[PDB]
């Protein structure tokens, strides 16, 4: 199987798994002390629930026998018939799902019932994630019309980003959101999460070539490039508006990482530089805008991942360099790729937002998404986990 | 040597090394602020001491020329005669030893003299760990009678688990153990440790195939499976008894990881599901039981690793699927494997508990294991390291 | 390209990248709460700035067409002409640069303007790092006269170490440095950084063989060996002088890691033991000495990396074992290698110290390195980032 290739993907899988709690730490540092445990716990739960559902039927629904090009059959339920390298792919893909669910927790920070999140997550994984994976990577209709997504610009970032926006709108602002700022209880904790996310992204984008080859190497180069550019942009903006806070710096880096994800294996360093530069700017604008509109999409999964993934997914159609991976974009003489990307981006963006909206309201109506005001007041660590973060 | 295989084991070795301080963080978050440094420091010391002893003679005693099938000779002392791939194996195995010693620190939390722990650790590594490794993996008597242990259900988990129980009983309860609860000073710190342990377990179980092949892939799949199942079980139990604390969730996940370790490369996903389900239940019961019996085996190395490793090691004899790795268990028509496992489990469990008991008392009699009451009062960070965790 | 080798270097690159924020956490725990964010932020900025400059021209200046054996041309600017495996090497090397810059932040702890550090870093990377890399690894004059540096004893440790000493002397002591001790605000945070540094060093030294072969395996063995020995030494010294603080333990381990870096792929375990033993002693003495001289080279980049790298680089000339990697040192009958090392060490030590001194003063004169007294008083988290570490 090429031990080298198996080695790299085994490693990449471990790396993406680390990103799940990595998201938890990243988010936890930004919420109040009384909700720190909850924020982290959500990422671990996201991992646990994802592994089970993926095995049970999630994998099959994403990559099983195609039906009308919109979803896969149940031929791989309980991994029936999944062997050898297919097992590794299943496992690697399983982790992409988990990270996606964790990113989404941005929209429910400090005020959701754990039980409700689990229910919603299970439904979302079933009706939004699996379909997307199938459409783009499971031989679905989007792949058929030529759409590309190297590492999940759409499958992972647009989905969680826009789903987060829908969820935030459904669950409502946190008490005191408009009145006064919620201060991050531990920026260092968030920076630890940020370090784990950058590190794990090596397996995320680099492992998406599914081999230890020139494409993986390219993905690693441009991934770091876009991250550095977007992080530099936010640093500049930070200075332009005051002082460069560390949160803005790593938030910018992540914008660049999300934007390059769908294009990591198709563009060159120059293209990577454009992608990161634009990502830094548009994502910052997106953040400012949702803030202006007073939407409590708390940790900016939308502005960063949603918008970053949207831009990067479209950028693929403009900058794909055939000398890099055969595929060519607009600037390389091929208008068709751009149209495939726009269709894919338009489709995934609308579906993620609208369907999540339906699922969120459904669950809210069925069991209620938000915790009581008093639980929100005492904090979810105590009220939802009967634990205290620090003593 | 197959660069791919060397690559994977090099990586797996790095991964297992990370698990050592990972154990330190995991444990540190659960003790009081005045003992945080001590708890972490112990894991680093465990690593340092293990590397030296392993090199000096530990490796040789585990994997050197067999003598009566119970121990290895000194032909590899100072790595004399260890070259090429044998060097990599030595290094990979070295890290298993280190993690084992760190897990054991559970039984001495908040009240042991560092010097005494070092002495005990050196003795334990010599008279308990090395023998076990030799018996099962060094061509010892247990391997000869057909016993199997894929990644250390017995060599690592039962040994540390039961040794921890013996040590706890010898050193005695912490002041105020029975009167009032000791609160974890930083659950987030513990969750960081938990994240590092899950991540490193990819190298632990996955690297035990000693190649980037189908067995490693299987080990990685079932390892994540069992972890998710057992973590889900503890989450359910947590809800059944109140609220699902994050500590219970990751403790359950670890129970599943310990249980699947001895079977990672022999069972299928369905078997992995059974193993994790039972592990979650029995380990939770074990925890409750040692608590009822008022034994201060502080961080549950026993209930989690001891019992989890015991179950998983026995489960190998029941669920080994020949279609997975040739070996077959009871349910697959082979009663013999079960008997080999029971013998191995009975032997390793009794020896670990009884011999550790002897060593602990010996050291206690020789130099005294426990710190003075006042040192316990002011905390070991100050009294044993003359340091203060946070300012 | 040997998927196995690409796999290992891809992984090693991820590992070295993690070391950058790893340095940030390591240092952050040792400074005051009011400067925690700043200390970490500096490492992330170091990474961001390094990636950009490396791509732009840093890589080319280090490994491009040689000119007079002191520097490389601009033939690889913007990675023009860099493809395949050369891209991976570029990326792997990029991370070495980033870690070096982060280590250097030791000398400006708690009192530097971020903008000034960036300017200085950019200049230093250009006039000190790139040249060194070229001299030793880019076919420069030092390589030509037979000097060796397996993983950066000189390129990374001596450079940052001595540059840090120069910077510290130029920027001046922190207010109250001589009067009273500055207490570490979070030793646990530092230990997390220490864990990440030890773990990442697997990719640092182990990946320097640029293949998953016997040399990488050796590097990994001796790297862990030297670390354990030096850490044990500091533990002993700690006991000899009082109690073994955890900071001394990991600081000793790092001394051993820095010392073995230039020799990781040339010496045997016995040589590794000598290197770590001496490193522990000389680095401890160096620390005591700079303290006696009242130099506020704050986090001992000099005593640990500077001196550790100096010793290890010289040790290569004494202990290189031809049976390990062909090269032989003094004790193995070859006096020439020792002379090459002394020349290289003398050259790199003097240049790093003197040129950094010039650059630091230049920048200080141009824009001023140090923050105002009041900013130093309120802390750089607030004054330089308008952020608060913990709430």
Swiss-Prot record, chains A, B, C:
| pH-dependent activity | Transport is pH-dependent, with a steep decline at pH values about 5.0.
Per the record, GO CC terms?
Answer: plasma membrane
The keyword Mitochondrion belongs to this UniProt entry's keyword annotation: no
Quote the InterPro entries the UniProt record gives.
Answer: Ammonium/urea_transptr (IPR029020), Ammonium_transpt (IPR001905), NH4_transpt_AmtB-like_dom (IPR024041)
* Annotated site location: Twin-His motif. Important for optimum substrate conductance: 157, 305
Location in or out of the cell: Cell membrane
Q: Cytoplasmic face: residue ranges?
A: 28-38, 107-113, 171-188, 238-245, 288-300, 364-391
What UniProt keywords are attached to this protein's entry? Answer: Ammonia transport, Cell membrane, Membrane, Transmembrane, Transmembrane helix, Transport
| A Pfam entry, by short name | Ammonium_transp
A molecular function GO annotation: ammonium channel activity
Extracellular side of the membrane: what ranges?
1-7, 58-89, 138-152, 209-217, 264-268, 320-337
Q: What is its main location?
A: membrane
Bilayer disposition of the protein: Multi-pass membrane protein
Where is the chain membrane-spanning? 8-27, 39-57, 90-106, 114-137, 153-170, 189-208, 218-237, 246-263, 269-287, 301-319, 338-363
Q: Which PANTHER family match?
A: AMMONIUM TRANSPORTER MEP2
Instruction: State what this protein does.
Output: Involved in the uptake of ammonium/ammonia (NH(4)(+)/NH(3)). Transport is electrogenic. Transport the ammonium and methylammonium cation with high specificity.
Which family does the entry's similarity section mention? Answer: Belongs to the ammonia transporter channel (TC 1.A.11.2) family.
Question: Quaternary structure?
Answer: Homotrimer.
Xref: NCBIfam families:
amt
What name has this protein been given in UniProt? Ammonium transporter Amt1
């Amino acid at each position: 199987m090429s031990d080298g290739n198996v080695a790299w993907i085994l490693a990449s899988t471990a790396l993406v798994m680390l990103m799940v709690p990595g998201v938890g730490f990243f988010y936890a540092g930004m919420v109040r002390r009384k909700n720190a445990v909850n924020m982290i716990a959500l990422s671990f739960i996201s991992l646990i629930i994802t592994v089970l559902l993926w095995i049970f039927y999630g994998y099959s629904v994403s990559f099983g026998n195609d039906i009308s090009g919109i979803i896969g059959g149940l031929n791989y339920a309980l991994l029936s018939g999944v062997k050898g390298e297919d097992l590794l792919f299943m496992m690697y893909q399983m982790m992409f799902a988990a990270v996606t669910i964790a990113i989404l927790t941005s929209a429910i920070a400090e005020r959701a019932k754990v039980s409700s999140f689990i229910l919603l997550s299970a439904l979302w994984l079933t009706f939004v994630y699996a379909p997307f994976a199938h459409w783009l990577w499971g031989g679905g209709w989007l792949a058929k019309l030529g759409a590309l997504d190297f590492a999940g610009g759409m499958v992972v970032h647009i989905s969680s980003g826009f789903a987060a926006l829908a969820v935030a709108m459904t669950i409502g602002k946190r008490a005191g959101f408009e009145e006064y700022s919620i201060e991050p209880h531990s920026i260092p904790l968030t920076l630890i999460g940020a370090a784990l996310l950058w590190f794990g992204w090596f397996g995320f984008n680099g492992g998406s070539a599914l081999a230890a080859n020139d494409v993986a190497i390219n993905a690693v180069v441009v991934t770091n490039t876009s991250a550095a550019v977007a992080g530099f942009v936010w640093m500049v903006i930070g200075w332009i508006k005051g002082k460069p806070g560390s949160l803005g710096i790593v938030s910018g880096a992540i914008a660049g990482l999300a934007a390059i994800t769908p294009a990591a294996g198709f563009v060159d360093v120059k293209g990577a530089i454009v992608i990161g530069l634009v990502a830094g700017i548009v994502c910052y604008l997106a953040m400012d805008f949702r803030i202006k509109k007073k939407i409590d999409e708390s940790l900016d999964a939308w502005a960063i991942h949603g918008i970053g993934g949207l831009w990067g997914s479209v950028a693929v159609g403009i900058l794909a360099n055939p000398e890099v991976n055969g595929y060519a974009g607009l600037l390389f003489g091929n208008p068709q790729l751009l149209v495939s990307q726009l269709i894919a981006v338009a489709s995934t963006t609308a579906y993620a937002f609208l369907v999540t909206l339906i699922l969120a309201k459904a669950v809210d109506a069925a069991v209620g998404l938000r915790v009581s005001s008093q639980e929100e007041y005492v904090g979810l660590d105590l009220s939802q986990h009967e634990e205290v973060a620090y003593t």
